[PDB]
Design an enzyme around this catalytic site. Sequence first.
Site, PDB file in Angstrom:
ATOM      1  CB  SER A 103      -0.821   0.052   1.346  1.00 24.73           C
ATOM      2  OG  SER A 103      -0.428   0.001   2.403  1.00 24.73           O
ATOM      3  CB  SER A 104       3.881   2.164   1.532  1.00 24.24           C
ATOM      4  OG  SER A 104       3.716   1.860   2.894  1.00 24.24           O
TER       5      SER A 104
ATOM      6  CE1 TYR B 115       0.309  -7.457   3.674  1.00 22.16           C
ATOM      7  CE2 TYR B 115      -0.177  -5.822   5.192  1.00 22.16           C
ATOM      8  CZ  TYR B 115       0.491  -6.070   4.048  1.00 22.16           C
ATOM      9  OH  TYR B 115       1.313  -5.287   3.371  1.00 22.16           O
TER      10      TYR B 115
ATOM     11  CE  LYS C 195       4.122  -4.676   5.857  1.00 18.51           C
ATOM     12  NZ  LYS C 195       2.690  -3.860   5.630  1.00 18.51           N
TER      13      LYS C 195
ATOM     14  CB  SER D  93      -0.776  -3.739   9.410  1.00 19.87           C
ATOM     15  OG  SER D  93       0.212  -3.927   8.435  1.00 19.87           O
TER      16      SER D  93
ATOM     17  N   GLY E 134       4.589  -4.017  11.769  1.00 24.51           N
ATOM     18  CA  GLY E 134       4.027  -2.747  11.058  1.00 24.51           C
ATOM     19  C   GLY E 134       4.229  -1.522  11.126  1.00 24.51           C
TER      20      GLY E 134
ATOM     21  CG  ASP F 174       6.846   2.938   9.800  1.00 27.29           C
ATOM     22  OD1 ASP F 174       6.497   1.494   9.632  1.00 27.29           O
ATOM     23  OD2 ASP F 174       7.298   3.428   8.830  1.00 27.29           O
ATOM     24  CD  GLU F 175       3.571   5.789  13.454  1.00 27.59           C
ATOM     25  OE1 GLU F 175       3.987   4.590  13.002  1.00 27.59           O
ATOM     26  OE2 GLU F 175       3.061   6.609  12.789  1.00 27.59           O
TER      27      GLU F 175
END
EC number: 4.1.3.3
Lengths: 301, 301, 301, 301
Positions: D45-46, D135, D163, D165, D188, D190-191
């Site tokens: 999706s990115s 996912y 994965k 998310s 998933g 990033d933060e």
Amino acid sequence: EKYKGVIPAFYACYDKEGNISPEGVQGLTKYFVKKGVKGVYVNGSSGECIYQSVEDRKIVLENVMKVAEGKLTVIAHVACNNTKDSQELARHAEGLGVDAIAAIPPIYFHLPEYAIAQYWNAISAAAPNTDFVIYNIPQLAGVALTQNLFVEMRKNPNVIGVKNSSMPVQDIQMFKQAAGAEYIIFNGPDEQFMSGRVIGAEGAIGGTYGAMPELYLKLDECINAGKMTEARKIQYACNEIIYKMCSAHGNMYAVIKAILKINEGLELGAVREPLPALVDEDMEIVKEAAQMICDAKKKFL
Amino acid sequence: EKYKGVIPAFYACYDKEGNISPEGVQGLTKYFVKKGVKGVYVNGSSGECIYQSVEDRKIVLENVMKVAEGKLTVIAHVACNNTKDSQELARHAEGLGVDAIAAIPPIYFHLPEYAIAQYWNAISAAAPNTDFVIYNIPQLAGVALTQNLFVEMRKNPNVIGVKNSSMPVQDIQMFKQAAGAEYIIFNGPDEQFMSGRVIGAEGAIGGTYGAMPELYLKLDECINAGKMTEARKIQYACNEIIYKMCSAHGNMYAVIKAILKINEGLELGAVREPLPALVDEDMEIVKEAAQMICDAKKKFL
Amino acid sequence: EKYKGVIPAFYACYDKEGNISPEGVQGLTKYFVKKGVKGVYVNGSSGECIYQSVEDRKIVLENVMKVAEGKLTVIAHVACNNTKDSQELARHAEGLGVDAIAAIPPIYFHLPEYAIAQYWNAISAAAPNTDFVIYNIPQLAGVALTQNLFVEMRKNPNVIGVKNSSMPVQDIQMFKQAAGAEYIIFNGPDEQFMSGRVIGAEGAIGGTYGAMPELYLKLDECINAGKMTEARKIQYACNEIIYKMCSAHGNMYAVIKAILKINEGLELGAVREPLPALVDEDMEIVKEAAQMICDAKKKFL
Amino acid sequence: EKYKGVIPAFYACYDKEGNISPEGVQGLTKYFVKKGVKGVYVNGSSGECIYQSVEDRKIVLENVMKVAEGKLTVIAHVACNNTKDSQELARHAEGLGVDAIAAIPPIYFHLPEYAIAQYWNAISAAAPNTDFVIYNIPQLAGVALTQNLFVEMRKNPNVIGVKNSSMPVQDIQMFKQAAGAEYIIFNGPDEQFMSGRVIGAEGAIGGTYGAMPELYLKLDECINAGKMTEARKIQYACNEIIYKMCSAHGNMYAVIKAILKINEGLELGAVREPLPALVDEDMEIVKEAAQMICDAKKKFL
């Protein structure tokens, strides 16, 4: 007025190879003309639009337009994952003389209201002399149509109203009250048809209408006549049929295409993967629902 | 039949010191008898029950029962955070000859259906010769009344039905269809009164009814008469009044007690903290809503 | 520094009649002093606070304070459904010299941020020389602590931090980053202890800590030592014990009180209704979890 | 081992006409090889996969494979709205020798677990000698990967992991614990990079990694070295950069392509509509974020 009443969502008609069937589409459109419904909502999610290519969708509308012209009013759902593909279907649909054009919001990502407004306005610009209907479908596309995004959309003069797919009938009331008499809200939840109609939805577009169109037309006749007891009896009959159709392992639209094969001899093909196919065990559910439709028709018509 | 129609939720009536006012309760009950409503729903969340002690709630019902007996039907909401305190209110309420007893599900924690069934049955056992009404309020208490928990509750013969506070009118339809003619579903969402009524709710309990009872009685008269256009006009008028009452900084029930002070001279006190009090800036909203009520009454009655 | 480390939530200690046991509380406090934990979080939801009366909660803290004084740091959760009852517990707790006072947001109704800020500040005003911990528990109390509300609450100098009960560890990071070194964020989700501790939570308050305090102290020793492999082994062991404790028909806290009866000979009574009691079938789950705790201790200590 | 570490999501590289740029892709792949990242996650999706045609996605992977072969490990995301289009990308990707293939669940409609299992297995069958990543993305695709569905998918030997998310790091823990050492969970969010990496994610795929790959590699070096204080400093620096990149009117990936144009001279084009474009007012946010990246690199590398 041309949008008021029962507008069934048009199913995906395939051949035995899993490709769009021109004969199947023309066939299913002759069925809706014959049943005396107000219009047909083409290439919506009930039409498996998420799973069709741009060319697959052009073939469906082309074949609906060969049969439907001065008999049915046609709303063509043109949204795609892209703005680009959506604009292509919007152009194409205006090219074939369609009544209105419809668009779900952007999907997968939860975009801001300005991006949603830009997406819808870009599609509306690709078909600038045709009516446009926006959505409120929080449950699938993420977030609900706000009154601020709706105010922004009413600035586009082609916007004729909203297809309200959310569950609260208050949403219909709030959008109708805010917009006024120059706009229409279409009832989305088939199971609340009578409730969304009385509170302000002059339109009604549904995915189960195709399985028993005469029941929704009769239900609508009762609503317009003000006989809420007879309307409530038809609503309950329709709702138990829906709950039986949803009890199968295979997808509801797979169940409906098999019901139309039993009750009408229509061959609409299967449902496109990833939608689950019917299994051997579902045929008794498919036969039971088809008989419940025949029985409802004899009781209420 | 005694539960069919307009049953307003009874507000919390305080004195100027923030304690339950016996005079205020008797006063507000004389108001509902005078307005000709079917019944009164006492110590529900609109009655600030979450913020009352066990003794505060006993005083309210005691004072409602001095005025209301053979004129209004009374539903006493007896749920507490504890099963123990809930049973105490259930006993007490049966002691004063109440019509039905009501109970929200357990709160804060999301308990399994067996614990919810045990909580409700334990309360029903504390008042074993009185009718019991269960809830479906997913939005505040966490999860929605399932058909499996409802089937389990129908095993208790005192259960007469459900107070449906969820937004989908399909929930009313599904519970009415599953339960049949020996049960009643009360419409919870005031803004969808007409919609929940037509689809199967023979009862209607609401928190805004007290502000304009004559409008809901007139709306109900139109629904029963089958004039959906006049009903839809009253529904829209009621809904714009609600949206004005909700636009204040202070809580809606604080707004309503100030409207009843203007329109009726009733002194119901303020709202118990943490409910937000009205501020100076809200008085224009309070005056505007009170006038919208007076104007609606003159237009539709 | 006095709030950094492992602070177990203190359980509800009952007698055989279902009333608060002074002997049981003093007994459970001697247990935590003996296990060498940093502090004790009294009358939180793990302490069945939703189901206790104002007087029940005063008796618990009074009896914790007889044992815990210069050995454990005490956080007293004082929120009630009312602001009034909450202020009474806040006064009382300051009267007994607690280290901090804690408060969940207002429950059942979804109140605006100003009402939540007023509720918390009113409780903080009732104990004006004692530290105050706010919450972020969107899953039970409705909505998450926004940065805006948090900025508003940092205006009160008694606010020392946030008890983060939400699932995203990003929430800890965001509150720690926004607040800085003069505030502390306590990790709420026991199952993510190691993950919330590494991203910024210097504190940790949990409901399962009491069942195996030595495991969380060892896990914390590994986190502080920077041995993430040994920490991850203890986290996984703790998490499988929690999942076994949650697999019972009876409530997790009922399971924990029965584990402490097996492993420690502590008699904490049962769980207050509506919390579901243990059934005969749960005793094998209760015995299996108690043995998993004994085995984890021998493996990691 | 080839999947362990920092695997940035590969961005959509366009020309000035809005079509896929072969030169742009080869260019962005040379950038990732140069930065020493473990691999590249293509057409996720990115990578704007929702908005690309089947042929657009083939061109991207083809051009990534010209540059990346024995230097980077490549995960090719092949899911499409259709099972048919997804199978075509799966075949194609195996034809070019990718390390693994990935697939989000079916989108828009909420299909049962059997349809999701059939969708993923059908894609896995189209590339039967290549590793497959499933996912858990409840927030966009509707519902979370259940343990039951995960058990079903572990029956396919090509499935190498998940994965993750979703926001709870407990999900990573639960999938890693259930699956064991022969599977990998990719972080998933990033933060929460550091938090998912310590609880069990040996892999990490993110959409912001491309903007500051050296920071995530340094953060990962600290995590592997067990220096949680230096890791937490880098995590906080990365998170404030993300929050600055998300504060623009234009989409985050539009912001990132403009940052890479400033900091690296890479020309990746704009974002495909409906993704909102950058406005004149966003350039100060774009310049501020690019400088925060340069400053973080000098401070931590």
